[PDB]
Amino acid sequence: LYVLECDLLDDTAKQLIPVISDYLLSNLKGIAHCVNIHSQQHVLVMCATAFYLIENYPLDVGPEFSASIIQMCGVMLSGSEESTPSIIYHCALRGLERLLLSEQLSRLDAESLVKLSVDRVNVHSPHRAMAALGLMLTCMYTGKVIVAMERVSVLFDRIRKGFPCEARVVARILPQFLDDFFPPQDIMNKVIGEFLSNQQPYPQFMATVVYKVFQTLHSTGQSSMVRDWVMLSLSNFTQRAPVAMATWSLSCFFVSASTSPWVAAILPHVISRMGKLEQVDVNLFCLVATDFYRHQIEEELDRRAFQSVLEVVAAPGSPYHRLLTCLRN
Amino acid sequence: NRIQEYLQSSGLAQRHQRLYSLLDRFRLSTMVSPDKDWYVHLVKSQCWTRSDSALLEGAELVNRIPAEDMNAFMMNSEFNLSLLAPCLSLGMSEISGGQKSALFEAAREVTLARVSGTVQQLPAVHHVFQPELPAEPAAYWSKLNDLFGDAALYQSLPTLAR
Amino acid sequence: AEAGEQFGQLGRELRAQECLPYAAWCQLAVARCQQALFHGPGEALALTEAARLFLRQERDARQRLVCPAAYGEPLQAAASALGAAVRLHLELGQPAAAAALCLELAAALRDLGQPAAAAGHFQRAAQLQLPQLPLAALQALGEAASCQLLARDYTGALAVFTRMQRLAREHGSPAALGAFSDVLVRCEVSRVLLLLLLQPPPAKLLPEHAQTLEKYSSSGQLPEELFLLLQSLVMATHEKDTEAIKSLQVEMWPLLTAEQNHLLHLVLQETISPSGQGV
């Protein structure tokens, strides 16, 4: 590693690089699936020098070597939690991530490993999945709806079948991720659709996602586009599991779509009290509803659709019913 | 009536609603614009308490009040001192982004203000803390026993050390 | 033959003057001589001695005198020799001896500050022992779970604890046989704490974890006070009453091991201050 680092190795020393490359391949194939059996520090070293050779000496090693080694450590990543120690998994993944992030990799080899990124997102261990989330994130930020539809889908799944720490991270990076790879109308059914559902363990994490996606629309010349979508999905919000959950999701939906400075800034409060149906909760729900209605509704005749939808499930003591009483006058 | 009053006077009625409903059912058988001032009052309901369930959210709520009002908000008593660590943690997170944190600057000037405040209550002369027999001086050790033995004071120390 | 004895007394003399790297080298030489003699037991003993000498070298360089210039150099040689010895043992049978060598390597790695590799080697030893010595395999898996908790691999630790509980129930029975009862108690408490910490969603919630959580909402083999405190802890974490977890954490401190005390502290910490938010 020292010798080939920056020394302008003379073209006579082109008889050394193949020897290292031959040793690299001849000693990685016999361990590429049983890494745990063999020495950790050793295999770490071949990966380190192999990654440097591709990044810095692409012509000196044949394109087969660059290809043969990406698949070589691809099977290392595709191993189980026992067949590949977490040390080796993260080293190869970050090493591959650097190799793609540096344009020295060939086009055939670059697209050879972007496929490997999506496979390793779905693993049990949060850190192996979160690390593989990074590799896929760079693999798709380097290339730039035909395929990005799949990638955003496997992001919403991790929020659904992931631990709260794992899911909170994905929920935090979604608002920028959606703002980058899709136009707002292309991905807008999913964000509301994944927000409220029965297969959503953390709708409180998705509450911020709809908020940031709405706010990044309200302040970027789409203050009326969000008005169409809240009206469109209000009927969907009307039918949602328990009544308290339905109002809570509805209350935080108006918060996410409210342009008032002091209403758009109380989202953590409603997220904090989740599933509560106290007097303050309905009072907050009515207040945010009318402030979306009275202040920033579309027009005078569009209120009929708003008045029609919420009247459907009006009950004697329902929070919806109290909203009519305030909204009527 | 006393049983009903006691349940409502405490959190047990909220914790056990079914029992309270049954007791009350037995009892009857016997025969505004959302302005800045509204926001401040709302966060005042959540950030002036002793609840530690939601501090990450409480930090964000206090993060949005005007910078000029931040100092009087935290300096004022009945403010959850457990929020100071989230307040500094969140305020630093946007300093690391390059911005100027009104929250972090207003929070660190509160932490040091309280740290200095609780030092004034310490004895003027400090003796080596002897775990075995802290009783050779009389006034000094008695000055710590009623200091470290105060729930309002002892609880305030780790919640300020954080 | 005679060369092996010569290398043996060379290694003995070198260890007498405590130049133990060369003693381990001589042990490797006598192991090679045993290879030439096709004597499997003697070669395994020689490789074990060489590995032990290298491990003592690394311990001195890292534990006795903490040398920052040490980069785990004799540890690599120790691991290579131990792997060769394990391979020889397995090729001549005796999986118990190979599992013992793997346990030795895992203990060495755990003391040297590499919990992940230690847990991996502990799991390998348990797998080697499981078909014949289920209790030894359970102990090795317990060491692996402790190492994984050291490496902050909480989900891996939960998986290992669940595997140990399954193995103890299916091997130590219905009531446990005492030697498996303590293993089951440790499994139960550690799994409950890890499930309160991780809080798996319904997708990740395996039937075993769901059943265990159901049990805490009667006491199989846990002491009644500990079982009641664990039930209170589960209810509090499902209720988000931080004062309750604080009081319990104070109360259950003497009844839990240091590992379980750490797990309960992690549960409390993730309750007040959730991780993953970035702040």
UniProtKB/Swiss-Prot annotation, chain B:
Q: In which tissues is it expressed?
A: Expressed in the brain cortex (at protein level). Widely expressed with the highest level of expression in the brain (nerve fibers, varicosities, and nerve endings). In the brain, the regions where it can be mainly found are the cerebellar cortex, the neocortex, the striatum, and the hippocampal formation.
Q: Which domain of life is it from?
A: Eukaryota
The record's domain comment reads:
The N-terminal Gln-rich and Pro-rich domain has great conformational flexibility and is likely to exist in a fluctuating equilibrium of alpha-helical, random coil, and extended conformations.
Q: Which disease is it linked to?
A: Huntington disease: A neurodegenerative disorder characterized by involuntary movements (chorea), general motor impairment, psychiatric disorders and dementia. Onset of the disease occurs usually in the third or fourth decade of life. Onset and clinical course depend on the degree of poly-Gln repeat expansion, longer expansions resulting in earlier onset and more severe clinical manifestations. Neuropathology of Huntington disease displays a distinctive pattern with loss of neurons, especially in the caudate and putamen. Lopes-Maciel-Rodan syndrome: An autosomal recessive neurodevelopmental disorder characterized by developmental regression in infancy, delayed psychomotor development, severe intellectual disability, and cerebral and cerebellar atrophy. Additional features include swallowing problems, dystonia, bradykinesia, and continuous manual stereotypies without chorea. Some patients manifest seizures.
User: What protein family is recorded?
Assistant: Belongs to the huntingtin family.
Query: What does the annotation say about its assembly with partners?
Result: Interacts with PFN1. Interacts through its N-terminus with PRPF40A. Interacts with PQBP1. Interacts with SETD2. Interacts with SH3GLB1. Interacts with SYVN. Interacts with TPR; the interaction is inhibited by forms of Huntingtin with expanded polyglutamine stretch. Interacts with ZDHHC13 (via ANK repeats). Interacts with ZDHHC17 (via ANK repeats). Interacts with F8A1/F8A2/F8A3. Found in a complex with F8A1/F8A2/F8A3, HTT and RAB5A; mediates the recruitment of HTT by RAB5A.
Q: What is this protein called?
A: Huntingtin
| Gene from which the chain derives | HTT
- Please indicate which part of the intact protein appears here, giving the first and last residue numbers and the full length: 2037 to 2223 of 3142
From Swiss-Prot, chain C:
What the entry lists under InterPro entries is as follows: F8A, TPR-like_helical_dom_sf
The UniProt record lists the keyword Cytoplasm: yes
What coarse category fits the chief subcellular location reported for this protein?
A: cytoplasm
Q: Which keywords label this protein? A: Acetylation, Cytoplasm, Endosome, Nucleus
Q: In which tissues is it expressed?
A: Produced abundantly in a wide variety of cell types.
Q: What GO cellular component entries does it have? A: early endosome; nuclear body; nucleus
| Localization per record | Cytoplasm; Nucleus; Early endosome; Nucleus, Nuclear body
Q: Which Gene3D superfamilies match?
A: Tetratricopeptide repeat domain
UniProt superkingdom:
Eukaryota
Q: Name one GO biological process term.
A: negative regulation of proteasomal protein catabolic process
Function recorded in the entry? RAB5A effector molecule that is involved in vesicular trafficking of early endosomes. Mediates the recruitment of HTT by RAB5A onto early endosomes. The HTT-F8A1/F8A2/F8A3-RAB5A complex stimulates early endosomal interaction with actin filaments and inhibits interaction with microtubules, leading to the reduction of endosome motility.
Query: Quaternary arrangement and interactors, per the entry?
Result: Interacts with HTT (via C-terminus). Interacts with RAB5A. Found in a complex with F8A1/F8A2/F8A3, HTT and RAB5A; mediates the recruitment of HTT by RAB5A onto early endosomes.
UniProt disease annotation:
Up-regulated in brain tissue from patients affected by Huntington's disease (at protein level). In a Huntington's disease mouse model overexpression of F8A1/F8A2/F8A3 impairs proteasome activity leading to the accumulation of mutant HTT and causes defective mitochondrial functions.
Q: What name is this protein filed under?
A: 40-kDa huntingtin-associated protein
Query: Which species is this UniProt entry from?
Result: Homo sapiens
* Lineage, uppermost ranks: Eukaryota, Metazoa, Chordata, Craniata, Vertebrata
Q: Per UniProt, what is the name of the gene that codes for the protein in this document?
A: F8A1
